[PDB]
Amino acid sequence: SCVKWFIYGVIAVYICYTLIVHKRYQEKEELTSSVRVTLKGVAHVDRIWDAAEYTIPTQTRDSFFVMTNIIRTENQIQKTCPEYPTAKAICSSDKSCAKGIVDVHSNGVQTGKCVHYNITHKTCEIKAWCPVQGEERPPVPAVLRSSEDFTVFIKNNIHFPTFQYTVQNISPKLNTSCKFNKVTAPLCPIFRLGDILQEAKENFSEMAVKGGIIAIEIKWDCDLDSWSYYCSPEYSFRRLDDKTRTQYPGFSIRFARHYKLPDGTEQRTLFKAYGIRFDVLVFGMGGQFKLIELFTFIGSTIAYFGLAVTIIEMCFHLYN
Amino acid sequence: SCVKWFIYGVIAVYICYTLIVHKRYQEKEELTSSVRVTLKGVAHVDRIWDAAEYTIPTQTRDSFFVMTNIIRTENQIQKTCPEYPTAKAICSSDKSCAKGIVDVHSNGVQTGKCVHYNITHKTCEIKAWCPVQGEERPPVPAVLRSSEDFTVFIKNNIHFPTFQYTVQNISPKLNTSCKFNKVTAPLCPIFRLGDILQEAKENFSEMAVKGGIIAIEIKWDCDLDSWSYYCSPEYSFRRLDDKTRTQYPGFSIRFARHYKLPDGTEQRTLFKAYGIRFDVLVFGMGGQFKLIELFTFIGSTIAYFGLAVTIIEMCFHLYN
Amino acid sequence: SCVKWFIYGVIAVYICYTLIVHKRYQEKEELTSSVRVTLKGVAHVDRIWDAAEYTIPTQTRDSFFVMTNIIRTENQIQKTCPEYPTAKAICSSDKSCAKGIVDVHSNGVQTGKCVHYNITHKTCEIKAWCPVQGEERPPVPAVLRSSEDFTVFIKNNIHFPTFQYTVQNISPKLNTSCKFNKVTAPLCPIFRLGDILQEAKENFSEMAVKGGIIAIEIKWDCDLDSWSYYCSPEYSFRRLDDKTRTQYPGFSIRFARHYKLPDGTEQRTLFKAYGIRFDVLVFGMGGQFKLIELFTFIGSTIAYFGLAVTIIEMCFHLYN
Ligand SMILES: Nc1ncnc2c1ncn2[C@@H]1O[C@H](COP(=O)(O)OP(=O)(O)OP(=O)(O)O)[C@H]2OC3(O[C@H]21)C([N+](=O)[O-])=CC(=[N+]([O-])O)C=C3[N+](=O)[O-]
Ligand SMILES: Nc1ncnc2c1ncn2[C@@H]1O[C@H](COP(=O)(O)OP(=O)(O)OP(=O)(O)O)[C@H]2OC3(O[C@H]21)C([N+](=O)[O-])=CC(=[N+]([O-])O)C=C3[N+](=O)[O-]
Ligand SMILES: Nc1ncnc2c1ncn2[C@@H]1O[C@H](COP(=O)(O)OP(=O)(O)OP(=O)(O)O)[C@H]2OC3(O[C@H]21)C([N+](=O)[O-])=CC(=[N+]([O-])O)C=C3[N+](=O)[O-]
Ligand SMILES: *[C@@H]1O[C@H](CO)[C@@H](O)[C@H](O)[C@H]1NC(C)=O
Ligand SMILES: *[C@@H]1O[C@H](CO)[C@@H](O)[C@H](O)[C@H]1NC(C)=O
Ligand SMILES: *[C@@H]1O[C@H](CO)[C@@H](O)[C@H](O)[C@H]1NC(C)=O
């Protein structure tokens, strides 16, 4: 009959483990998140890149983009010019150049003339925004590599609407001259971009040349009970784009700045901006004591394990 | 006896409660949402602010931004100038200004000289877009406070792909001259921004100074069965950022408008636009009768509670 | 006595079915996704529309927007002009035109005078960006209808962080000269926009006039076990806005390009750009064998079905 009370002890111990460890006495709710970011830093290389230059106006609620490398082509006007030298765009004679837009890779409608691109090579003439943008190989060191030293301030506000409870990842009074540390300052959400790529096992200088995608994962697992109150974030950092060269890594945005000359003709300045798009993913759950939950758990285990206790009871009776 | 059939009655009543109240006969599916917004309104304050002035192009699917307050600094050129005099940017001598150092408060790379801003205030000289933008105190009544009277038309379309059923938050014929009221017109998705912030227990005049974040929460709980058909939206409104002064509330975007002067050198106009970012959160579930589910429920409860019945009959028969 | 071991066989075959089909030996994990898109194509209509022209800078992680139809109003200056002829704006005499307080549909503050719009009709004078933008009905064939032939390259990388495993929807070495095929080339995520709308049962020519919303749904159901390895995406395509005359379909963005005249006064060019906003929705789950999961399943079925077996054993003895 020792085996019997061993089974009873196992059942009781399991019910208490489930109750306490899994907190079956509390209601759970998924958090509702709000993220805001503010960038600080300036790079002076052939131009002064403050935040207004290396950012685009942010209406998104979960991500933000920092420019790390730049290809700029200025004062381009709609006219005729040589195509950029592409396998299908290089020509020896006008017979190679078909009229109109031929493939999706062209920057303009082809006139059919084969015209010099540089001293050495010829290429198909096109009607386009001229001169066509032609580095195509981003600068050997990244232009805005200095962005490694920029800092980002991530204001994350979490809401449990049922519990009417709100938390943020900021200490009650925060000294700005702080840098995030897992143990010493967990409530300092100021991150050096280089440090972020560091925790993601990535080399900023290398990644900055062609861009990429970094996920800032903020996890909240919250107990709102007065006994054992824990509600604080856990950050992890991960690179989301395949780093391998053949698999098309990196990220860039294309944009233009349009101008009008005194004559009235429109002229534009075309940017291809490689950069890192940071995706801020905030998931989490929170729980709080509720009587209805405790009662339903008690009733549930009383029913189920009450049936188990009686069946095991009669089993030991009927056979011994 | 009495206690036995009391237990059987409790079991039967519970199976019925579960079946009907929890609708265990229907398959449930989580909705997939689509939001579009269109803003209407004009403010005449020193300039004519129509939608093209007080919004930025919205490619995001979950949110939209309305400008409420504005700081503009015009005709700034890349050169050297004094930093803006903010405490901890002030200096008496050149040793306080480190050379080539970008600090959290600085708008440019420091030259290392300490230079006059006023007669009275000296500050670290920097290479930056000059003059530096230095209000840091947004206009005392909000510039676009009148935006309180703008209206937003929120077109929400939800799909249940399994059920191949689609719903919108718009009445079958909608008069534009309607304005949302919780009870009188629930399917009028035209909202006065002031009314939204009112529903969020917030003062538009106050919030318009430094900006903020409002969540427009659209809840759908849908029964698609013909005998009890309910599928209509439920709106709630909540401010997501802590409004307290010390915890860094508000929201803004920085952007610039670039021009070129005749010599070709760049000059830009820098905007710091405080405003409200509205985040449209659409959550929801819908359910529809399915035979496979009803059969699974009947089979499940016959199995489990059939075993329970055999326990009570056989086992309590064994005794007495 | 045959019925008893028939019950045992049904239970056993069911345990095996659940184990194998539902893969109860696997830990399951929800997907973490990353999408990048790149647009390629050029349209020649009165101007050269390359990607910098028909797109807006995209910082969002789940969507992208292509312009299909355009209304442009150039050289708009703040001054007085007639309102656009909308029902509430047409007037025969000055008494209908109220001064100052405007309507939500007005483009500027009213002077209170009733002034000529055409030869034929008059309308209320306003202070606004003049001339007001007045087609209100987009061009009868869409101006950028040719975007049908543009291609989009959708780079999707999914991560299972617990299993430390990542996949992408791109073949291991991919030649760009591929076009997506459901069966022949499923790992070629290069789509012609026309073909996208085709798969969604939509006509690009038709949709291009007023725009709309297309959902590109990428589903991953992944088994990472070596003996049964499947991890590849399946795409579906759906139009999210109700295709119907009265229920307000279509999509557009408003933006402006500001210029300065030699005088220094502001001049702007106002765009209403109709287009298709494509939403890339990536959901999925993946699973991998884990010993703790298999053990918890073994223990659970031993517990539950051990009680069931003893119950029916006691029943068959005690009664027949
Ligand atoms: N990425 C970042 N890394 C580090 N710190 C950051 C970062 N982003 C923001 N901060 C700090 O956050 C403070 C509060 O900024 P916040 O109000 O949220 O947004 P803004 O900086 O746009 O200001 P605003 O809301 O418009 O008044 C800023 O004020 C100040 O320090 C700055 C500040 N400044 O930004 O210039 C100057 C200052 N003094 O004393 O000169 C004091 C601050 N402060 O105490 O927070
Ligand atoms: N924020 C808002 N608050 C209130 N109503 C809004 C708002 N946004 C849109 N509406 C109304 O919604 C009607 C349908 O808008 P819709 O046509 O989808 O708008 P878009 O700007 O996308 O234009 P489009 O359809 O592309 O030509 C509009 O037509 C009209 O009333 C407008 C309209 N208008 O100028 O937009 C004028 C009009 N009269 O009578 O002059 C009648 C309308 N109407 O009855 O719907
Ligand atoms: N929507 C699209 N439809 C079809 N193809 C697309 C699309 N988007 C991108 N591609 C192809 O993807 C190739 C790799 O581009 P990717 O690395 O993703 O981005 P970027 O082009 O910005 O990179 P980069 O800055 O050049 O390193 C591009 O190179 C090329 O073909 C282009 C390319 N080009 O973009 O100009 C020229 C070329 N030749 O031979 O001239 C060969 C390519 N190629 O083989 O992939
Ligand atoms: C001319 O252009 C072709 C195409 O890129 C290139 O291979 C060649 O090196 C260029 N020659 C000069 C003079 O730069
Ligand atoms: C100096 O400039 C700062 C700018 O905020 C101001 O606080 C101070 O009163 C000014 N004093 C004079 C004399 O300009
Ligand atoms: C006059 O303007 C109104 C637009 O409301 C239109 O009904 C009418 O046909 C126009 N007549 C012209 C263009 O002569």
Numbering used by the authors:
A (entry chain A), B (entry chain C), C (entry chain B): 27 to 346
Excerpt from the paper describing this PDB structure:
The vertebrate P2X receptors include seven subtypes (P2X1–P2X7) that form homo- or hetero-trimers and are involved in diverse physiological processes, such as muscle contraction, pain sensation, inflammation, and perception. Each subunit of the P2X receptor is composed of the large extracellular domain that contains the ATP and other ligand binding sites, the two transmembrane helices that form a non-selective cation pore, and the intracellular N- and C-termini that modulate channel gating. Among the P2X receptor subtypes, the P2X7 receptors have a unique, long intracellular C-terminus with protein binding, phosphorylation, and lipid recognition sites. Therefore, P2X7 receptors play a crucial role in inflammation, immunity, neurological function, and apoptosis.
Here, we report the crystal structure of the chicken P2X7 receptor in complex with TNP-ATP. The ckP2X7cryst construct lacks the regions encoding 27 N-terminal and 214 C-terminal residues, which were predicted to be structurally disordered, and includes the mutation of Asn190 to exclude a putative glycosylation site. The crystals of ckP2X7cryst in complex with TNP-ATP were obtained by the vapor diffusion method, and diffracted X-rays to 3.1 Å resolution. The overall assembly and subunit folding of ckP2X7cryst are consistent with those of the previously determined P2X structures, sharing the chalice-like trimeric architecture with a large hydrophilic extracellular domain, two transmembrane helices, and intracellular termini, resembling the shape of a dolphin. In the TNP-ATP-bound ckP2X7 structure, the TNP-ATP molecule is located in the ATP binding pocket, and thus interacts with the head, upper body, right flipper, and left flipper domains from one subunit, and the lower body and dorsal fin domains from the neighboring subunit. First, the adenine ring of TNP-ATP adopts a similar orientation to that observed in the previously reported ATP-bound P2X structures, and thus forms hydrogen bonds with the side chains of the highly conserved ckThr177 and the main chain carbonyl groups of ckThr64 and ckThr177. Next, in the TNP-ATP-bound ckP2X7 structure, the phosphate groups of TNP-ATP adopt a totally extended conformation, whereas the phosphate groups of ATP in the previous structures form a bent, “U-shaped” conformation. The different orientation of the ribose group also changes that of the trinitrophenyl group: the trinitrophenyl group in the TNP-ATP-bound ckP2X7 structure contacts the head and dorsal fin domains, forming three hydrogen bonds with the side chains of ckLys66, ckThr112, and ckThr202. Consistently, the ion-conducting pore is still closed in the TNP-ATP-bound ckP2X7 structure. This “incompletely activated” conformation of the TNP-ATP-bound ckP2X7 structure is apparently due to the insertion of the trinitrophenyl group between the head and dorsal fin domains, which prevents the complete cleft closure motion in the ATP binding pocket.
